[PDB]
Amino acid sequence: GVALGATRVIYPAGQKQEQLAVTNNDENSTYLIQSWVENADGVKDGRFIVTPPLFAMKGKKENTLRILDATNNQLPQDRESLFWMNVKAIPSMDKSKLTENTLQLAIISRIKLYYRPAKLALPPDQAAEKLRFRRSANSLTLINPTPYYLTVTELNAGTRVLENALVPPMGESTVKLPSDAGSNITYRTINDYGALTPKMTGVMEH
Amino acid sequence: AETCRIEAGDKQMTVNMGQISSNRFHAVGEDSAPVPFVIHLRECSTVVSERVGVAFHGVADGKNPDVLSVGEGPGIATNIGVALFDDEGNLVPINRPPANWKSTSLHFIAKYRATGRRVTGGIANAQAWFSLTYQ
Incomplete structure (x- = not known):
């Protein structure tokens, strides 16, 4: 094959x-x-x-x-x-x-x-840590201030796994928050080489 | 990381559908016997195979856009299409966005589905493209 x-x-x-x-x-x-x-x-x-x-x-x-x-x-x-x-x-x-x-x-x-x-200034291997989060009662918005697409995966709110998201450069993407979503966010990304990056803690916007 | 090496049932990726018995269909939406087939995702990391979306693309039946057309012409069966199902009996409509499940073997079912009132017999071949969209 x-x-x-x-x-x-x-x-x-x-x-x-x-x-x-x-x-x-x-x-x-x-x-x-x-x-x-x-x-x-x-x-x-x-x-x-x-x-x-x-x-x-x-x-x-x-x-x-x-x-x-x-x-x-x-x-x-x-x-x-x-x-x-x-x-x-x-x-x-x-x-x-x-x-x-x-x-x-x-x-x-x-x-x-x-x-x-x-000639992008920010290195690709520093993009994943720049992701930020904005949270409402029923949704979570991912904020990507970098020039790179972020493929965000193993996105967890507390113990609740959320949908994967492709966050466009200098843009945003929103996923649903189930009722039992916790307050501690973690995530990984898929990097340039197709590999999972280290687990990171989600940082709220502003 | 490499993408998955895709293999089907036989090396030609042909699913044998049997023969049409036209007098067995009595209502639009009636399905013939299930025809199982499996698509294997080989020699790839679980990081990759857990993150692939799948879709079936093809020419839709003229009356039912969710199922594959068997074509038209002399000696060709009429008023049936080829419907696709996942391993939980759920229809997988063709020409849809990539879909995910939660393993490296995807099990599907094909059936002939009546798309019109009066089904006629004949040859009932279908063609589809199975697309894997990698995250």
């Missing part, structure tokens, strides 16, 4: 292209691999080009997808922009047509593509 080498792509502004590994570990399988980029709404977006857009992987091998910036430098320079990298694996093996009806599947893996401006 097919896997990708990363669960997100950080695209550094100014690079002509960014690489993403795609692998098949099965000698006895052949796949067609089709790749494209979508905007945050999931709409195919030509502002990034993927090469090769369509190719065959026969058996056990690794290949490299190249994601090319075609934004003409029009994206914001003070914060990340969110796109989605899509990699479809089409099983391309010589099956035999049965008398049976079939439901035929193909697989698409979708990972975040963060376009990251150059």
